[PDB]
Design a protein around this ligand. Structure first.
Ligand code: NTA
Ligand code: NTA
Ligand code: FE
Ligand code: NA
Ligand code: RU
Ligand code: RU
Ligand code: RU
Ligand code: RU
Length: 649
């Protein structure tokens, strides 16, 4: 049977679950999902029941989503409650630190300041800010209130033990835990900042806009970002302490039943959701408050399947809570992420030769690696510009570029015999790409071509081709050479994958190859001993220039599609400085003074350059590059990008 066993934590919740059960039976057909109702004493008892295969689903706040993730529960987010309009679904809130403009201090200078909290034990007002500050607090850190009382000079921390720690209630004597206290709650803590009582208020992004209508007033405030800078209040998305999901349905990581859970809930909102006015209303609690779901919910969004709990909660939230739960405080080694059995081996060699300054983490895919850098399991890796885009939108930034001598050149290579082909009209021809979503083989050439055909349905523009990463049924997988499941994969087991592979695809099957300016020189004239390249001459090939003409291969400077941004090392913002130093020190020892091919870094890289000003993916890639990728995103199929675009569009 297709049964979703929902877990309730109270008799009122269980009664609603039963009404939920009986009404869905009148709406869902025989082959569809039905609900069962398991009543337990608490949210943690529900988490344990789900993990024990005695129930299937429960909706949790962020704190318990974290608890549900830890072993041995290992639950996962599947469906997201959303609020507000259908056009702009508000799935998360942002915990921010608001300050007065020109007060002259950053997040890392809060010791001694006066703080305004919404209330002790609340998320944005306490657990998150104190969670992040935890190791900055003085020892002993237990009890936590004593440590905070000895960190801020004074504060208003409603519901704090002012008798034993009167510093915490200096700004609100008694620290009344009710609205009788002027500085209690979300309006109160911001009022505690506005009135001049405190120097910082830990609140939600929307508190400022709800308590100050005129933007002129809002300009007198700023936000403290975790990189120790400030930003205006309406840039909370790029300057917050944490992005927190409001209410989240969780299920087992393996054993589900994510498929049924979404079918059940999506059906339920379509017939009993907001503005549906039936006997049974999914988001009403006739004899309670927020039973099973929050009464203010407007519907449900499916959580993208690539996303786990650490990625859904976010790096900084996980850091804050882990500090509160465990209470553990210490440049540290840089954990590099390797993708192959050949790449890991190089990493282990590199690790022992670094006297411990480099450690090694592994994963199957680049996206898996990028996810491990986001959550802290890994620290750094080198990426093609196309993956830097993914990494940037996922939160990471570039810290070092690999220089090869401004970046490398992207060109279109054809066979010289074929005198007919031009850049003007390539429709109906056979294309060879390094892979989908890569700088030289896709983002640059297909970005330009998008502007000339007005769509990204490129399998209907070219007759066929090989663009590793495309869907296996696509005409852009027909020319690939991989065998079995390897066919058309964007990895080594597909022989037409990469710069060289795409050129090989041209030699043997295709009409045009989109690669970089050195690819042809390195695979002709005997440079590449493989049979497919051994006897090739670089004079039998030429490049397609944008004006519509063709030029020889070694004249790439005058005949090129666009300058491609170099590959770059990406990391988290909180480890940018440390990766920048250890690697600049590492190439000084092992630089210009790989067993297989392009392990960790490309093999034609001389050094690792600094960027200074270009420490974000938009600054590094360029404006025109980012807009091209935006146009190509309409037809793109990246699941990692889908997940971290669910948090940050
Ligand atoms: O919240 C509660 O537990 C009390 N109930 C009364 C009851 O048990 O029916 C709320 C109400 O129904 O108004
Ligand atoms: O390559 C250069 O140095 C200048 N480019 C612009 C560019 O590469 O985007 C001229 C051109 O490509 O037509
Ligand atoms: Fe590249
Ligand atoms: Na919390
Ligand atoms: Ru009751
Ligand atoms: Ru119907
Ligand atoms: Ru009743
Ligand atoms: Ru150019």
């Amino acid at each position: 049977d297709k049964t979703v066993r929902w877990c309730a934590v109270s008799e009122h919740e269980a009664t609603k679950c039963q009404s939920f059960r009986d009404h869905m039976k009148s709406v869902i057909p025989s082959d569809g999902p039905s609900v069962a109702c398991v009543k337990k004493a608490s949210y943690l008892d529900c988490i344990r029941a789900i993990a024990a295969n005695e129930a299937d689903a429960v909706t949790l706040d962020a704190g318990l989503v974290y608890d549900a993730y830890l072993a041995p529960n290992n639950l996962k987010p599947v469906v997201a409650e959303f609020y507000g309009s259908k056009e702009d679904p508000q799935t998360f809130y942002y915990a921010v630190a608001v300050v007065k403009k020109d007060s002259g201090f950053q997040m890392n200078q809060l010791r001694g300041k006066k703080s305004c909290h919404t209330g002790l034990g609340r998320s944005a007002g306490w657990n998150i800010p104190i969670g992040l500050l935890y190791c900055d607090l003085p020892e002993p850190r237990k009890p936590l209130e004593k440590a905070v009382a000895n960190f801020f000079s004074g504060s208003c921390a409603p519901c704090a033990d002012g008798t034993d720690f009167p510093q915490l209630c200096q700004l609100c004597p008694g620290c009344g835990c009710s609205t009788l206290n002027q500085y209690f709650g979300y309006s109160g803590a911001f009022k505690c900042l506005k009135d001049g009582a405190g120097d910082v208020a830990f609140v939600k992004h929307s508190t400022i806009f709800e308590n100050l209508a005129n933007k002129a007033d809002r300009d007198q405030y700023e936000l403290l970002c975790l990189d120790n800078t400030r930003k205006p209040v309406d840039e909370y998305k790029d300057c917050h302490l944490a992005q927190v999901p409001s209410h989240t349905v969780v299920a087992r990581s393996m054993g589900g039943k994510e498929d049924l859970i979404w079918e059940l809930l999506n059906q339920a909102q379509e017939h009993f959701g907001k503005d549906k006015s039936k006997e049974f209303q999914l988001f009403s609690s006739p004899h309670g408050k927020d039973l099973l779901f929050k009464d203010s919910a407007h519907g449900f969004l499916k959580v993208p399947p690539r996303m786990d709990a650490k990625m859904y909660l976010g790096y900084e939230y996980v850091t804050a809570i882990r500090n509160l739960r465990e209470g553990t405080c210490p440049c540290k080694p840089v954990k590099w992420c390797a993708l192959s059995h050949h790449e890991r081996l190089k990493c282990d060699e590199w690790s022992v030769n670094s006297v411990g300054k480099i450690e090694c983490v592994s994963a199957e895919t680049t996206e898996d690696c990028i996810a491990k850098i986001m959550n802290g399991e890994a620290d750094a890796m080198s990426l093609d510009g196309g993956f830097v885009y993914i990494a940037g939108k996922c939160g990471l930034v570039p810290v070092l570029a690999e220089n090869y001598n401004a970046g490398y050149f992207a060109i279109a290579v054809v066979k010289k015999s074929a005198s007919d082909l031009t850049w003007d009209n390539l429709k109906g021809k056979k294309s060879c790409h390094t892979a989908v979503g890569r700088t030289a083989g896709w983002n640059i050439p297909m970005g330009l071509l998008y502007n000339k055909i007005n769509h990204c349905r490129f399998d209907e523009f070219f007759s066929e081709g090989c663009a590793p990463g495309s869907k296996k049924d696509s005409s852009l997988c027909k020319l690939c050479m991989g065998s079995g499941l390897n066919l058309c994969e964007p990895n080594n087991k597909e022989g037409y994958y990469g710069y060289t592979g795409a050129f090989r695809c041209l030699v043997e099957k295709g009409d045009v190859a989109f690669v970089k300016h050195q690819t042809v020189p390195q695979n002709t004239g005997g440079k590449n001993p493989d049979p497919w390249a051994k006897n090739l001459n670089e004079k039998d090939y030429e490049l397609l220039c944008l004006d519509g003409t063709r030029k020889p291969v070694e004249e790439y400077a005058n005949c090129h599609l666009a300058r491609a941004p170099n590959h770059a090392v990406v990391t988290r913002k909180d480890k940018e400085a440390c990766v920048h130093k250890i690697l600049r020190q590492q190439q000084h020892l092992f630089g210009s003074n790989s067993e297989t091919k392009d392990l960790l870094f490309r093999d034609d890289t001389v050094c690792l350059a600094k960027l200074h000003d270009r420490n974000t993916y938009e600054k590094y890639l360029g404006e025109e590059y980012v807009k091209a990728v935006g146009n190509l995103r309409k037809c793109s199929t990246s699941s990692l990008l889908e997940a971290c675009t669910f948090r940050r569009p």
